[PDB]
Amino acid sequence: KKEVRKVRIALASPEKIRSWSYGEVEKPETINYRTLKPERDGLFDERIFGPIKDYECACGKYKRQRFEGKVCERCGVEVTKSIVRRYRMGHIELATPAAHIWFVK
Amino acid sequence: ITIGIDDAVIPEEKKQYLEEADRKLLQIEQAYEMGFLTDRERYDQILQLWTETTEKVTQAVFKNFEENYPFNPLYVMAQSGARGNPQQIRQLCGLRGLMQKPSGETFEVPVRSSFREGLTVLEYFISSHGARKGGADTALRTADSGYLTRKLVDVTHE
Amino acid sequence: MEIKRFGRIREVIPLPPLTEIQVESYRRALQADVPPEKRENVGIQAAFRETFPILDFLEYRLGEPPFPQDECREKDLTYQAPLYARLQLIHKDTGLIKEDEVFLGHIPLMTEDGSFIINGADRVIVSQIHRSPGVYFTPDPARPGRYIASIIPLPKRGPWIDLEVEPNGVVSMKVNKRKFPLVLLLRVLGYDQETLARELGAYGELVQGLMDESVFAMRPEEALIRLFTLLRPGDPPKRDKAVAYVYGLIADPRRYDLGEAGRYKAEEKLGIRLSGRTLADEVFLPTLRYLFALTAGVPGHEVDDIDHLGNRRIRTVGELMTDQFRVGLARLARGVRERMLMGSEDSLTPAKLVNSRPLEAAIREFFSRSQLSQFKDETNPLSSLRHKRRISALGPGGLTRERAGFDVRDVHRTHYGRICPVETPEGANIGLITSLAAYARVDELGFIRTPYRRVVGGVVTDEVVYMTATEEDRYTIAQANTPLEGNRIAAERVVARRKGEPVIVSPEEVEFMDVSPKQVFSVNTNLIPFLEHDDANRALMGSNMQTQAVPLIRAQAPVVMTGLEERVVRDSLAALYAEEDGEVAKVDGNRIVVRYEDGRLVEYPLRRFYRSNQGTALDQRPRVVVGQRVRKGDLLADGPASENGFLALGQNVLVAIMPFDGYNFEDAIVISEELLKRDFYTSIHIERYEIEARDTKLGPERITRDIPHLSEAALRDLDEEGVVRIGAEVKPGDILVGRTSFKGESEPTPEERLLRSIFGEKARDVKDTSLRVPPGEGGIVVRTVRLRRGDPGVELKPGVREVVRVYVAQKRKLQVGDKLANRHGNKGVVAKILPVEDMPHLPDGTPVDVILNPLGVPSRMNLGQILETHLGLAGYFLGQRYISPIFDGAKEPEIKELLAQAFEVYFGKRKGEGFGVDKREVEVLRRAEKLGLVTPGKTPEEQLKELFLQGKVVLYDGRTGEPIEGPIVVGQMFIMKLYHMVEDKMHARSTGPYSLITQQPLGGKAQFGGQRFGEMEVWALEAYGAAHTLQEMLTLKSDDIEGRNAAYEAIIKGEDVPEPSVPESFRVLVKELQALALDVQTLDEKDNPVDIFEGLASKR
Amino acid sequence: AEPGIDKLFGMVDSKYRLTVVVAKRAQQLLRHGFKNTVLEPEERPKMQTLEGLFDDPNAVTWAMKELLTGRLVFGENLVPEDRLQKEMERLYP
Amino acid sequence: PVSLETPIGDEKDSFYGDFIPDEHLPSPVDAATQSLLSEELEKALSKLSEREAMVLKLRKGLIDGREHTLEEVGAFFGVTRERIRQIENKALRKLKYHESRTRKLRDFL
Amino acid sequence: AXXXXXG
Amino acid sequence: IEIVVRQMMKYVEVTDPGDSRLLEGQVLEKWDVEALNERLIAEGKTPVAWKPLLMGVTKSALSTKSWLSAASFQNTTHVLTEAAIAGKKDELIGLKENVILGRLIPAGTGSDFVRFTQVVDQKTLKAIEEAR
Amino acid sequence: SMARPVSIGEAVGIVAAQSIGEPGTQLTMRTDITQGLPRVIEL
Amino acid sequence: SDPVRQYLHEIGQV
Amino acid sequence: MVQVDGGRFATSDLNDLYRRLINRNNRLKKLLAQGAPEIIIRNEKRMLQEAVDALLDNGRRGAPVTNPGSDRPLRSLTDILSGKQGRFRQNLLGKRVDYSGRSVIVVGPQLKLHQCGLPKRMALELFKPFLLKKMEEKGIAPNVKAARRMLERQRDIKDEVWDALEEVIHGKVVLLNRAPTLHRLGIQAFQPVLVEGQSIQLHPLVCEAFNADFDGDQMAVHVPLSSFAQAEARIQMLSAHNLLSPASGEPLAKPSRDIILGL
Ligand SMILES: [Mg+2]
Ligand SMILES: [Zn+2]
């Protein structure tokens, strides 16, 4: 409603970094070759970044817009627009901290 | 208003103007053989000579058109600002002028021919150098246009 | 009709074979018709000789092509011959000697015209120009004082050598990064100060520079080992291996190869004899003493010019092919490396060792993906010629943009007779892409040579010598147009050239003379009559546009010709000629069958209505009837764009040069409707459409006449299989091929599922993917080609079940927006088509075809079109054509004479039919004598003759019936229709596909991609201070989703366009920054974060 | 071109003001369907159809033609926005 | 896998993935026709008795995104499994009459 | 090849 | 050309940091410096001593208060690191920033001068009194 | 563009840049003192 | 740089 | 991750970097739990750092990481943000526009200064969404999907439709642009006059500002959508409202060529 008159750029605390991500990507898997679907806890996982099909969960339990914001109890996938896969951030938790090479080099 | 080959009207003066340019060249040549002049001095004198004669010939063409053919199509298009400039008009009627060498220095011997009379094959080849330079020049100029405008927008946009 | 030839200059020799450059190169490259034992060492034989022994090479042979050319084009197969290689395996200490003939894969073959068929498309390999190998002197740009020596071998063979002197006085040497005194290498060559005392000491103070106490006093092997300290670190000298790396660097022929042409350059420049193409010793000593000599200001010693054509070598098709072949062969041997150890040492065949994949991949790469391998220009025969005669400075092993400055691009004084000054692209390729001169030839050394007559004293002979750029400088060469009585020079002052300079001489001083002016220009350039009256700038454009000429159904050869027109069609082999004296038995559209004196019966099939790369129709029309006597060299059938064996690039039309009501304003052209009535400038164009049916995981894609939701109205023109019927007239939107594909994982939307039941189960598994006719396109269906998997002889890429092709033809009449051009560089689009009554007309009632604006003449300074017009008028009334040579052409007196001769046909029969002069003609003549075009007091009969002699007539304005005040130039001008055509160039978009990621508008098969709005347009809109318009350009019309959908919806509903949501360009940015671990917040005025993501980004 | 453009330029202290005003007035005429026009029936902008003269479909032409009569009142902070909207919706639903 | 961001053509001006279209999101045309489709569906669907409308809504999966068998809808309303079928058919027939009459939904296809 | 469209 | 040259003189180099947070030899826009000196002399604090500076268009662009604009031009990773550590808040002053966002440019009809203008017909002219 | 005082809100920096840049395409690339576009960028 | 060398050296120590 | 023709998959380079990062992080956690020697843990920590680098900025430190089979460096986040046809660099080339179009231009001498000839076939596509609604308002179509299906085939185009298009474009204007756009007048607004033929007809006087000639120049056309954008175009950008050079103050639209010649 209220227009944007400024744009600020600061660093990101891991606290701030995780305030973004809808889950941690825990696995080096993109999709499955057979089913052409995101692996569990992988880079494309619908559980984190959201639904591949609009207003429909992964397992297919809730297919209607009537459920919106409702997360499935089976597949664990929120029911909303798929557009959120363009937006929703993920993250990765590091065993050892790593330096941001922008600031180092 | 139309263009026939007879609308490019060579002034009679061009002959005289050119004849005088030849004798005046001999003087410059002999003065070199005696040792009065160095290479650069005779070069500069030749170029100076041909420049003078070229301007003279242009003036001759336009005075000719002015007096004897006020309504001539080339002259009218030029004077009105519709089409053409005195240099081009010159290249049609009067002499072509001195072509440039590929290295950037001027050629010693000019092109006596007009475009109506038609060029010698050699004269043509000689003109082709300046032709190329102008070509790559326009090519580059159009290659990035808005370079400067970009640099200037970057500072002045706000 | 009779053709009147002009000019006093007789050509001592004819023009060389025009495709020679492409054909002889590949001839000497392959050596297929030369028996293996008699094969000289060059090309393939050379690569084989170099790569072997590794296993030793004996011979090779080229089999016959698995398929003919036409079938190769049709089935998308590369036309090629099998390469077999006979080799033998050497068993060391085993005493065994065996052999095998291995198949190394296929080598693409060149057709008779000099093109290739690669995967079905016609490709040309463009000849590349570079620096010839050899020894040169730069000099050093850093220190203006002295010069740098340079030894350059073949591009992939050997290192780069540079010799320079520093303030230390010592002579340096360059290998790779490091520079070291060459005085160390001198000792290794077996040289001592004793031999470096006398021979190299003569030059003043140039000796002690290479004299150093420590290293010179060392034994040869000592210095040799010392060199390895410089060459590589951490490597033990290993003085037996110290012979290996040094040999390989210099003395080795296999690793180091100086060009054969470069060998010649070395022998010529340094004035010595080399026992081979290897440096080592033999070369270093004269290179050095020559360096110090040029340093010393000694006679006969020149600083090399890099742009001199003596130092510029042209590598042709055979050269490039041989290079890539050598690469693939080296990789093959690289496979043999690891394959000659692993496994059985005692037993294996040469066939077991050889893997031909690197060779096949290398050659296929060179033909498919190389920069010098490109789509043939098939627009007409002339374009196909030029594409072969083109020279590129670009490509692998050559210049690029930013690597090319004004210097490389300028026309060199040595381009005379070698490279055309006139013909080059206007754009960023200018001077880099050039076309070979007409008479120009290319030897095996790769240098362009020009023919020259030899003169003895004041006598000119018929002996013609072919000299290269270097050799040309040596003599004094007079021009070809110098007055010649019989065989002797008739002038006291003879215009000539020395070292590419206009030196005026006397007959006895003269050595050589030019053959013909035609030698100093390209083929395209040579087709321009009255070239001498055209400024080189427009002439360039003429030369370039002639290849853009589209073949016309009615195409005529020009009324005014340079004389090359016939031989162009001849050597381009677009047309059929009589092979032997004989008589023709059978003639029709599809064939010509002849019988010669030998009783040989031969059937020549005619290619009819064939789609070229550029879509122009290549069509052969038989010119000879049944029972006619043919002589060897006689034309049987006209090719595309040829009229009676003369090149026909357009039509000859009646031009009036005048302004007409601003319709010819700014180079626009006005034409008479009559042109369309007689099908002038009407071309046949064939579009090729294709569709594929592939197997998706969702199911197979079916090509069928059954398409859901389609009535019979739309299906009426499709056959059983679903393909459209041959000869059907298809407009935009009509189905060319039917196809169905499974929709959305067999998931219908629930809102659709009920409405499908309301209408009785229209619900189906498949959706309509069928190929339709794109907007603005279409025509009459001509050919169809269907290929399927599981059928004989046909196999396609993985995953695709079948492929259909619809070849549609349309005959395009000339229309507003089409591009017309003459050979003098005057170009323009038709902005108006006038009804014949509106046209300006002669007193005999004949209307003009085209109205050209005179304002186009003065600034462009091409007068060749005016003379072409005049001579064209004369030849219009005299019913004759002309041949006016370049620079040798018709002279104004002769033209005026022919005009006077035609004036009898034009005005003479007026009195014979009982008519005098119009009162209007009287008025025009009064104004004309007022303007000074006609002598006062003479009869109107004569005054009109005076006007006509100037090439001007009296025209009447067809609208008012009144005369145009003052006379107007009219006459026949040859004008071409150009491949640029408004039909192909119009585009429009409301909505369409958007990019997956970027979400910006994207090009569809049935939809336009939309215009790109660049930064400069943004600046324009800003400057205008239109904020909203720019916003639309940046939001709704672009990548923003919510707003584009809502906007379309609003326009549909009739509601005004809604305010823009944030564009994806920004969102993707924000998220990229977040992916970079940088918080980017969009703050309020109060510094309170605002959501640009419209929700959906917020946790919880 | 368009009638009385110089005068429209004269009515404002900035061209872009005239643009904003005309645009917004067009939005008003569109949303309320032209019944809120200050133009009398004979002053109504007309378009030539095959049938005959009809109301000009273009809202900007209308806004400009209204503004030229000077009957419209423009400036910054005349009223609060929401009140203006509700009043206009009450007068012309 | 073939990499996106691969140079297309002889120039670096383009990437591969630049030319890949989005079939997932609705076209401005598609989404509009779809919204109008729903509007016009529920326009003439809710203009009859809500019962026989809800029958079609449940059975065709308009709500809950699943097609209900006659037994389930008959379990929801309380009538017989044959009764729900009869009222469904009379509802569909009623919609056919309304369709032939008003010609509204004829065009979505 | 570019400029005012020779090629 | 005057406007461009003026943009070359946009920047100054401070000799004396004064009572502000600035350091010695720090390049800053003369507008902002005179702004800080207008704020600090409205206090009575000591003034900042700045040296007038001339830089060409390239540099006069490269160094700017707006990180959105400076981002496009050159070496954007550096511009961004610097902008981030300092947490630079970019008010969108210029055109380039706004087009990057997609918000109406601060010029023409996007200028705050004429943007907020309102139009009312004479019927709703008398509807303000009835509504109050 | 009109003859009268500039209207407030004008894009005038951009207009300046275009005004200078547009003819810049007409300045000579090739020539002690720099000439044409090289001189213009030198300044 | 060239962490393969680093690590291989560290291994070379043992 | 998207599948293309055949069975092959096209996907971003980023995913490989993310992958190797994850692999190394997980192997690190595992090696920590296993209580591995500090040598191996160091090595893995190092490889992890390098992986995070290559993900964030590839090649900037150490060698660039490449997928086997190609020597091309994987495009990292830094490259994406800028420098290899980057975000800020891609926004220089510009984004495509939805309502745009392009064609070859011919002289318009009959046109008044504020007009431009627009091909009917082209205008139809440009103004289509307005045209559908105008077909609904008239008796030409029952609805939107109907009219839309009606225009899908050229043979199905009624002669009543053009009468509707004439109503759509009444009062409206379009933008014409010729590249390169050197100054603002390289984009101007004209009201379109529908014409038969595939060429855009351009007024002669505006040729000077556009640097447009008739030797085969093409011009892009654009449609302002908002009543606002339309307004801006019609007052600020109208061809007949800019008669004088914003640079020199002298008239830009002036007699030239044939005009001058005749007068
Ligand atoms: Mg042009
Ligand atoms: Zn679920």
CA of C505 to the centre of ligand 1 (A): 45
Reduced to 3 states (helix: H, G, I; strand: E, B; else coil), residue G28 is strand
Structure obtained using: X-ray
| Locus of tokens 């002999």 | B30
CA angle in degrees (0–180, nearest 5) for J100-J101-J104: 150
d(Cα C433, Cα C128) in Å, to the nearest integer?
9
Cβ contact A84:A51 at 8 Å = yes
- Domain with B77, as residue range(s), is 2-118
Q: How many angstroms separate the CA of residue D87 from the nearest CA in chain J?
A: 22
Task: Report chain C's terminal Cα–Cα distance, integer Å.
Answer: 92
Residue in chain C nearest A99 by alpha carbon? C1077
Chain E interface mutation, best of C742, C996, C1012, C1038, highest count of E Cβ atoms under 10 Å: C996
d(Cα A30, Cα G6) in Å, to the nearest integer?
55
CA of J255 to the centre of ligand 1 (A): 20
Structure tokens at J9: 């998959």
Cβ contact C442:C448 at 8 Å = yes
Return the domain boundaries, chain E.
26-106
Structure tokens at C829: 């689009």
Angle, helices C750-758/E81-102, rounded to nearest 10 degrees: 80
d(Cα E1, Cα B104) in Å, to the nearest integer?
55
d(Cα C877, Cα J205) in Å, to the nearest integer?
40
| Locus of tokens 């510009």 | J94
Contact state of J86 with G100 under an 8 Å Cβ cutoff: no
Structure tokens at J129: 């969404």
CA of A51 to the centre of ligand 2 (A): 10
Q: Cα C565 vs. chain centroid, distance in angstroms?
A: 20
Cα torsion through B16, B18, B24, B26, rounded to 10? -120
CA of C435 to the centre of ligand 1 (A): 24
CA–CA distance from J201 to each of C691, C777, J115, J118, J213 (Å)?
A: 37, 22, 9, 7, 12
| Locus of tokens 């037993």 | C347
Residues, CB-to-ion distance under 5 Å, ligand 1: F 4; J 213, 215, 217
CA angle in degrees (0–180, nearest 5) for B118-B119-B123: 170
Cβ neighbours of D24 (radius 10 Å): 18
**Interchain contact A/H (3 or more Cβ pairs less than 8 Å):** no
CATH number, domain of D13, equals 3.90.940.10
Sequence-distant contacts of C72-76: CB under 8 A, at least 24 apart: C72/C117, C72/C120, C73/C117, C73/C120, C73/C122, C74/C120, C74/C785, C75/C120, C75/C793, C75/C794, C76/C119, C76/C120
**Interchain contact J/H (3 or more Cβ pairs less than 8 Å):** yes
In the complex, which subunits touch E with 3 or more CB pairs below 8 angstroms? A, C, J
Query: C37 phi and psi, to 5 degrees?
Result: -75, -30
d(Cα C444, Cα C31) in Å, to the nearest integer?
14
User: Was domain J96-118+172-241 assigned CATH 3.30.70.260?
Assistant: no
Cβ contact C722:J33 at 8 Å = no
Q: Is A83 on the interface with E (CB under 8 A)?
A: yes
d(Cα J25, Cα A93) in Å, to the nearest integer?
8
Cβ neighbours of C1099 (radius 10 Å): 10
* Amino acid sitting at position C478: A
Q: How many angstroms separate the CA of residue C982 from the nearest CA in chain G?
A: 34
According to CATH, the topology of domain E26-106 is Arc Repressor Mutant, subunit A (1.10.10)
d(Cα C851, Cα C671) in Å, to the nearest integer?
6
d(Cα C594, Cα C631) in Å, to the nearest integer?
12
Q: Is E99 on the interface with C (CB under 8 A)?
A: yes
Residues flagged as binding site of J for Mg(2+): 213, 215, 217
Q: Which residues contact J72 (CB under 8 A, 6 or more apart)?
A: E3, E6, J66
Q: Is G61 on the interface with H (CB under 8 A)?
A: no
Q: Which residues contact C1020 (CB under 8 A, 6 or more apart)?
A: H18, J177, J181, J183, J184, J186, J187
Task: Report chain E's terminal Cα–Cα distance, integer Å.
Answer: 37
Which D residues 44-63 touch G at CB under 8 Å? Answer: none
Pick the CATH number of J119-171 from 2.102.10.10, 3.10.129.10, 2.170.130.10, 1.10.40.90: 1.10.40.90
Q: Cα J2 vs. chain centroid, distance in angstroms?
A: 24
Looking at chain I, how many residues does it have?
14
Contact state of C426 with B139 under an 8 Å Cβ cutoff: yes
Cβ contact C667:C596 at 8 Å = no
Contact state of J182 with B81 under an 8 Å Cβ cutoff: no
| Count of domains for chain D | 1
- Domain with D80, as residue range(s), is 1-93
CATH number, domain of B33, equals 1.10.132.30
Chain G interface mutation, best of A4, A7, A102, highest count of G Cβ atoms under 10 Å: A7
d(Cα C749, Cα A53) in Å, to the nearest integer?
12
d(Cα G116, Cα G112) in Å, to the nearest integer?
7
Structure tokens at C95: 């005493």
Nearest beta carbon to residue J39 from set I1, I2, I10: I10
Nearest C-alpha neighbor of C171 from the set C144, C152, C146: C146
CA of G121 to the centre of ligand 2 (A): 56
Chain A interface mutation, best of J11, J22, J60, highest count of A Cβ atoms under 10 Å: J22
d(Cα C706, Cα C466) in Å, to the nearest integer?
70
**Interchain contact C/F (3 or more Cβ pairs less than 8 Å):** yes
d(Cα J49, Cα J21) in Å, to the nearest integer?
9
Nearest C-alpha neighbor of B72 from the set C933, J257, C859, C857: C933
Query: C944 phi and psi, to 5 degrees?
Result: -60, -35
Q: Which residues of F1-7 are buried (b: 16+ CB within 10 A; e: fewer)?
A: bebebbb
Cβ neighbours of C508 (radius 10 Å): 13
D73: enclosing H helix or E strand:
strand D73-76
d(Cα J72, Cα J66) in Å, to the nearest integer?
6
CA angle in degrees (0–180, nearest 5) for C671-C673-C677: 130
B156: enclosing H helix or E strand:
helix B147-156
* Amino acid sitting at position C907: F
